[PDB]
Amino acid sequence: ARIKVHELRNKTKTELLAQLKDLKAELALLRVAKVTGGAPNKLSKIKVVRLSIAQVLTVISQKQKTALREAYKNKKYLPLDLRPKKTRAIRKRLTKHQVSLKTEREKKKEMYFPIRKYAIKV
Amino acid sequence: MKHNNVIPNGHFKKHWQNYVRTWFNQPARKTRRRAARQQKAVKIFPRPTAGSLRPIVHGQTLKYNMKVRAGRGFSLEELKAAGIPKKLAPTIGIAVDHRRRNRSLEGLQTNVQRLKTYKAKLVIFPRRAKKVKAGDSSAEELATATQVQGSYMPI
Amino acid sequence: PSHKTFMIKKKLAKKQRQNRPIPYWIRMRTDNTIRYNAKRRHWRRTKLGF
Amino acid sequence: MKYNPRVSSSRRKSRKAHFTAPSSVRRVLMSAPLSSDLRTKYNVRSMPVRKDDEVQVVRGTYKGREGKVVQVYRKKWVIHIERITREKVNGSTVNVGIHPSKVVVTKLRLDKDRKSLLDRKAKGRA
RNA sequence: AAACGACUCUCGGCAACGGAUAUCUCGGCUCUCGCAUCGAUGAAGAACGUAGCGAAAUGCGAUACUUGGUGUGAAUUGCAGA
RNA sequence: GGUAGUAGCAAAUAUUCAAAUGAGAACUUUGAAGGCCGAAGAGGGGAAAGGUUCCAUGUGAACGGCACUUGCACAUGGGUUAGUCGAUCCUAAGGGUCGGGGGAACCCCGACAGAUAGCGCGUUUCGCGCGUACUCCGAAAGGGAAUCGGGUUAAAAUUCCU
RNA sequence: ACGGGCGAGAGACCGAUAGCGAACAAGUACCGCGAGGGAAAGAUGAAAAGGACUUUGAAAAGAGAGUCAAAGAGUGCUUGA
RNA sequence: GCGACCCCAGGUCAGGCGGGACUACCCGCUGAGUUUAAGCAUAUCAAUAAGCGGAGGAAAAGAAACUUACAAGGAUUCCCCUAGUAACGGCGAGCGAACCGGGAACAGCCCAGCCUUAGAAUCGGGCGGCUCCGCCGUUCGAAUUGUAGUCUGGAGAAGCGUCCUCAGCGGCGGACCGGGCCCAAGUCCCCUGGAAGGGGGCGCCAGAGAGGGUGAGAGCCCCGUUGUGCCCGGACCCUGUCG
Ligand SMILES: [K+]
Ligand SMILES: [K+]
Ligand SMILES: [K+]
Ligand SMILES: [K+]
Ligand SMILES: [K+]
Ligand SMILES: [K+]
Ligand SMILES: [K+]
């Protein structure tokens, strides 16, 4: 009778929404029982129902976000909420290629006269 | 003030207590510098740990002109006399100083001889293992190559 | 006053909720050090100063 | 003598770490030795105390008492055994907390994870 | 007749008042070492809520003392229930 | 600690009798009597300010400078219902600003150095015509759209019921 | 270079009027219109085994009794000038 | 009236950037007096406190329009010394560097201008692909009031000789870092104790006798500590080898 997350992931959006509606109705009934001097057995179910509602909402949200990420894959100008967060400073940084850019003379210098491997023995 | 004492002139009228530098980190600094040296030696293996070769120069002023010490880098004239192109010298462990002028024959000749000794004592690995170029060394010389820890040419 | 802003009324509601004795079962907790509600307030002793 | 630079010999730090240990760490801290027969059979010295383990007390007023553990009160650093109890002034019965280091495990409750842990412990001893 | 008692003072036992002393310490102070990571992709701070039973502290955001993944492997616990 | 069970409890005319409860009554409740406030009140409501002090039940300790059975104290519960009453709208003294001008800068002046907001008519939503640089804040006493009886609660009413 | 941030190791340092103001729901209670000011407060026992029951009292409690090695340890509870 | 350019105006036009927070160190500005001078005004306190701004993991400085006068050194920074010195100062009170010399660390470079004119060879945006921190194709735009390339004084351009040097990919390891798992020895006999972890006797481990817990001073009761072994993940940088 307990909710299993791995079983929720195998359900469709409509079934998840129906289960969420049923859980919300049960939670409302439990609140009514609580306000009407309900027994401790009914009161203990409030936590279970709230956990089930949270689990269903989490599964729905994760499925939707995965779908959106797949839809926006291999595409530029993603929604801000779907872009990497990191930090502000890191986001502002120059790319690795931009950091490695150099003038033609510097490239010629590194190609012609790199630091050689040498030893001092003989 | 009283008695016969030297006139005091202690410079302690500012907030000197906020500018006191203590040396409780001296052993830590020594350890950190040793660790940096060891890491550098591992990185530059098998290049000598003493660093690039430096020229022999005179001391400045009449107080030290009899003294000989190490300069920043070899002059362009010295490199030309020794036959070492200036663009190649830094890559083979020879420091280059384009500023130092050569006013006397003795210093120039001394540094040219020093460069010749370094060249005689230098072993250069090829850029590519299977390709041997003009300045590269023979396989026999390369095989018996080791990192030198101390100063290889004391002044 | 009878005329009060919504924000002030909500703050007063929170202050009323915070003005109560501690639950009895708090004193039975393992390694408990709370004896009573040290932040109790009476409308005549200490004013809220809003 | 300690040599690892990331471990402290400070009394204050060790006491703080022990007394602020979470439940997962407390389980390991609440270990007990195995009996001679179990030690010989499994080639293991000590194990964390489990709920349904059979235990014999070896120290204190209950030095001879033995039974099945019925509760592992990690918050109180004690375990409770089947019949090791006492009578209050009221006359009701209450279990007496016993520290796991002062008992001996005579029979372990075995499962897949317990067997895996026993095998891992025996492997190192070789 | 200045005796017995009362008062005051004084000394001792006991009982009070008070929290010194000793023994402690998940706190403080000092030195040294490692690393470099806030924010309009909305920071720090500020408010209001949130637990079966909480006012504060701690945590969290109407999925609200927590959802999910992973690790570990039989608890949480003041009480009750699951 | 002595002071010391001492200094003090003295303004606002005043209490008395019987009964009820209670372990305990000069101080609680009921009835009777004798007085006071005397409508610019010791009566009946509001503004600010307070914030649950409001109402019911119960009460160990503390507090209510004597006392309490008691209560503006403590504990547990309950209570504030609007198209018409207000805020909300308007603008007052003034405040805060764009641009511009100053200023190292925090900031200063404030529509004063300027291509204003936009507003009406008909429409293939485009055209035509007007368009003086703040369409912002600022009054629970200024201005201002609209409700009256009758009834109802332990505690709400021009808000609840008709 | 580094009395801030995250994470570590140490000390001939302090030991609850000391040591940071703060060993505790401390920048808290509380004060001020405001800028600001700013405390006090740690120790039962190995284990609650936290004192059943009788009796007097309106009650708080007292006198017995019980737990514990100990109540000459009875929740502002090591000792107690 | 049309068109080209210039300057400017309105856009919730397509896509980006900025404000603010923290204080130990760091960079810029502004800026006292208490105090000392046995009074006090210059001076001192101090190029400090307070005030206003701006960064990072360090900042700042940095590759000589330098130091010196030597037989000369050779970017910057820091330490020792120079030195309480030269100098400054009602030459009073006081204040006060730098060079040489010895050490720590070391690293050098990029542009503007005359020099494509047989054609802007340069760059940005959109769109479509790819081994996607980027590359390719196409189309619009920027730019001649100048984007690329060469050159930077140590040089350099041009010309002639020398034949000296220069072109990647992928695999497996090492190095660095962060984690996970197991692994030594008494709880033997007697006594006092509420409880041995105390005393006595007999044993044991130790590359582990650091530390902590458990009913009193616990190496062998527990966690750990010492030393091996195995396992997992980052950093794509350095390094060896191989095709
Ligand atoms: K003298
Ligand atoms: K006496
Ligand atoms: K989790
Ligand atoms: K009564
Ligand atoms: K201006
Ligand atoms: K203006
Ligand atoms: K009005």
Ligand SMILES: [K+]
């Ligand atoms: K009516």
Ligand SMILES: [K+]
């Ligand atoms: K204090």
Ligand SMILES: [K+]
């Ligand atoms: K005692």
Ligand SMILES: [K+]
């Ligand atoms: K293009």
Ligand SMILES: [K+]
């Ligand atoms: K150019």
Ligand SMILES: [Mg+2]
């Ligand atoms: Mg003490």
Ligand SMILES: [Mg+2]
């Ligand atoms: Mg009148």
Ligand SMILES: [Mg+2]
């Ligand atoms: Mg009332």
Ligand SMILES: [Mg+2]
């Ligand atoms: Mg302006």
Ligand SMILES: [Mg+2]
């Ligand atoms: Mg208006």
Ligand SMILES: [Mg+2]
């Ligand atoms: Mg810099």
Ligand SMILES: [Mg+2]
């Ligand atoms: Mg000297």
Ligand SMILES: [Mg+2]
């Ligand atoms: Mg020097």
Ligand SMILES: [Mg+2]
């Ligand atoms: Mg393009």
Ligand SMILES: [Mg+2]
């Ligand atoms: Mg003892």
Ligand SMILES: [Mg+2]
């Ligand atoms: Mg062990």
